[PDB]
């Protein structure tokens, strides 16, 4: 007989796009949990991180014009960037240029504060 799981994995690897599989044949369910045209690829996340590294925080228009393309929701960029620092108020970082390591340590400090004050939600503190 034919093993349909490995057959499906091979056919998805050969034919399906990069956003549909996970470079081993496994189905990318995050692609189908959202609507078509709004997925926020890991390439988009890395581009947003590069934009925060290069330009300041809050200047979403420059990131939209250069670091992504010409199609990027400013609201979604603000929301994803706020999830990057781990607090649902991206206000104290307005203007600063933050790289990857300091982004990770800021997220760690925010998650530690949330766990230490017992006022924490999913990757946002309370603000």
């Amino acid at each position: 007989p034919l093993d349909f799981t490995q057959y499906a994995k091979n056919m998805r690897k050969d034919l399906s796009n990069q956003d549909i599989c996970l470079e081993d044949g496994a189905l990318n369910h995050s692609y189908f949990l959202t609507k078509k045209g709004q997925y926020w690829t890991p390439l988009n996340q890395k581009a947003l991180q590069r934009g925060i590294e290069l330009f300041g925080v809050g200047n979403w228009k420059e990131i939209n014009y250069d670091e992504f393309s010409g199609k990027a929701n400013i609201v979604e960029l603000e929301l994803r960037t706020c999830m990057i620092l781990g607090i649902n108020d991206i206000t104290e970082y307005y203007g600063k240029k933050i790289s990857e390591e300091e982004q990770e340590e800021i997220k760690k400090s925010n998650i530690a504060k949330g766990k230490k004050e017992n006022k924490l939600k999913d990757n946002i503190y309370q603000k």
Partner: protein
């Protein structure tokens, strides 16, 4: 004043909905599964730009076989592609033994029959979907001569389908079910196809995210 209170309420509403957005995007990056089955093979490409030779090579490489059932729900011109362009699709190279399922509107019944017979198939069966209301009544529609409350699927066949694969005297011609969603066909056609050819290699053309099924190769530009 009133606009200030509206601004305060809109701030409360964005604060409420940011929580929902972050909950969803934190559960997504935690191992949450959608309704799409794991063994689905979706391809997002225009059929007028898709290289079917790559699909033929991949199917022959990973199965040693061809497709058993090809189901089509064409966008008839009333995305309303064409008629001749739907005819020009290389279905003949896509199959050697099995069936084809083409959904036809009343204005494209004859065109569908002509396309099926021009692709090398022979018309042997016909499946009708009768629309229904929530009270178990026929959902009346509109037309020129009679009120249309039906939709037709035309079934061809190639080769020798009696070796060991396809079952006989199965399912029914009539599908009596509600007209849920947009111009979207019921899942009873998928159940009937799986009854006809259990554990087969199917292909679906002009598919959407509600058409994604196990063991089904689905093609659609919105997929």
């Amino acid at each position: 004043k009133g606009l200030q209170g509206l601004l305060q309420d809109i701030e409360k509403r964005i604060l409420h909905y940011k929580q929902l957005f972050f909950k969803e995007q934190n559960e997504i990056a935690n191992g949450k599964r959608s309704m799409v089955p794991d063994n689905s093979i979706p391809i997002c490409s225009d059929v007028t730009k898709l290289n079917f030779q790559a699909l033929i090579d991949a199917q022959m490489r990973h199965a040693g076989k061809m497709f058993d059932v090809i189901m089509m729900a064409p966008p008839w011109q009333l995305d309303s592609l064409s008629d001749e362009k739907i005819q020009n699709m290389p279905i003949q190279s896509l199959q050697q033994d099995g069936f084809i399922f083409v959904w036809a509107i009343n204005a494209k019944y004859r065109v569908t029959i002509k396309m099926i017979e021009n692709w090398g198939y022979k018309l042997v069966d016909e499946i009708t979907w009768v629309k229904k209301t929530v009270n178990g009544k026929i959902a009346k529609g509109h037309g020129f001569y009679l009120q249309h409350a039906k939709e037709s699927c035309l079934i061809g066949v190639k080769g020798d389908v009696d070796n060991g694969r396809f079952k006989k005297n199965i399912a029914s011609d009539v599908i009596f079910s509600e007209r849920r969603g947009q111009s979207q066909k019921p899942e009873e056609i998928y159940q009937y196809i799986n009854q006809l050819c259990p554990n087969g290699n199917y292909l679906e053309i002009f598919a959407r995210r509600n058409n994604l099924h196990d063991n089904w190769v689905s093609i659609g530009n919105e997929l």
